[PDB]
């Protein structure tokens, strides 16, 4: 299991919202400071992934691909329960070896939905969920401020506040907050870098070198063009 990440999902009046931080790590080292953890399965079905990053990306693309073909075959817009069933049966078959822990949310003709799924293939239903190393920090905020019949504005606020708890308190999480809002009868709105509370301060010094600082042995032009005419 790769350690990191804070992701949440929150149900509201007329839809569902998911959110995530933007830090990806390899051990104690930050590989990418502005990672995109909110993945699209279909236009109005989005998921966020924790655990092995390649697995969350790969399993999302595969099911997303099969969901698209299914949608074309049936002449119907994809359902969240289909994505859930296809994800869980794939993950169960690989007995946890595909380290994908996902929060799946979306809207479809049936309504708005929010599920979690765990690498071994178990799934859960809820009004508010959290996954990743910062899930306990996030869940603390959710358990403190969640109520029934939240508005769109209240749900976005709660979701991002839960991610912030992860950002500040969990070492596996950091940088920015990404948000995606899926409302019934509307286009899903992906809000990349919805919050940016971690811009690096200006450095004390410029480290631009004088030209000719580096010692060079040989120079040559590299032929990137194809074999030429004449």
């Amino acid at each position: 299991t790769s350690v990191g990440t804070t992701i949440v999902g929150v149900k509201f009046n007329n839809g569902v919202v998911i959110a995530a931080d933007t830090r990806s790590t390899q051990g104690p080292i930050v590989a990418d400071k502005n990672c995109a953890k909110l993945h699209r399965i279909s236009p109005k079905i989005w998921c966020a992934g924790a655990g092995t990053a390649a697995d969350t990306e790969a399993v999302t693309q595969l099911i997303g691909s099969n969901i698209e073909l299914h949608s074309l075959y049936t002449s119907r817009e994809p359902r969240v329960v289909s994505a859930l069933q296809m994800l869980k049966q794939h993950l169960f078959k690989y007995q946890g070896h595909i380290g994908a822990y996902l929060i799946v949310a979306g809207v479809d003709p049936t309504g708005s939905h929010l599920f979690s799924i765990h690498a071994h293939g178990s799934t859960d239903v809820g009004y508010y969920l959290s996954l990743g190393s910062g899930s306990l920090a996030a869940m603390a905020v959710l358990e403190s401020h969640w109520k029934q019949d939240l508005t769109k504005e209240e749900a976005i606020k709660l979701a991002s506040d839960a991610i912030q708890a992860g950002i500040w308190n969990d070492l596996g999480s950091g940088s920015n907050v990404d948000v995606c809002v899926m409302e019934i009868g509307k286009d899903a709105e992906y809000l990349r870098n919805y919050l940016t509370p971690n811009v690096r301060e200006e450095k004390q010094k410029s480290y631009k070198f004088p030209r000719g600082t580096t010692a060079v042995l040989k120079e040559s032009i590299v032929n990137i063009c194809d074999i030429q005419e004449e």
């Binding site: 693309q61 595969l62 691909s65 698209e68 073909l69 074309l72 075959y73 002449s75």
Partner: protein
């Protein structure tokens, strides 16, 4: 059981004709007219919705089909053959391209894949 027809059903006649292909083209000739026109800023494809009965809801029968978000298809000939080819064309755009390059295939290459499927039904057992 088992498919015991492992031999070609399309073969060259003494004159060099592939009979089954010619006869397939004859079936296409009997089919309802469809057309395509290319403009500078777009392409149009069109056909007639020849409804078999007025009790039939001809909107439920799609002769013009989306293959990818930027590619569409229309036909003339046997409808059921077209329908299964659209299913195969949609899937092959993903399996042999989108799952590899993370983008939809260019028109010419998807056409190439559909062409290959149709060629194989002309030589396979």
């Amino acid at each position: 059981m088992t498919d015991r027809y492992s031999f070609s059903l399309t073969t060259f006649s003494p004159s060099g004709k592939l009979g089954q292909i010619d006869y397939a083209l004859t079936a296409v000739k009997q089919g309802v007219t469809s057309l395509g026109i290319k403009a500078t800023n777009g392409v149009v494809i069109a056909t007639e919705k020849k409804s078999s009965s007025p009790l039939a809801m001809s909107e439920t029968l799609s002769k013009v089909s989306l293959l990818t978000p930027d590619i569409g298809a229309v036909y003339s000939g046997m409808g059921p053959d077209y329908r299964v080819l659209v299913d195969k064309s949609r899937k092959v755009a993903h399996t042999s391209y989108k799952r590899i390059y993370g983008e939809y295939p260019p028109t010419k290459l998807l056409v190439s894949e559909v062409a290959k499927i149709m060629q194989e039904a002309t030589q396979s057992g």
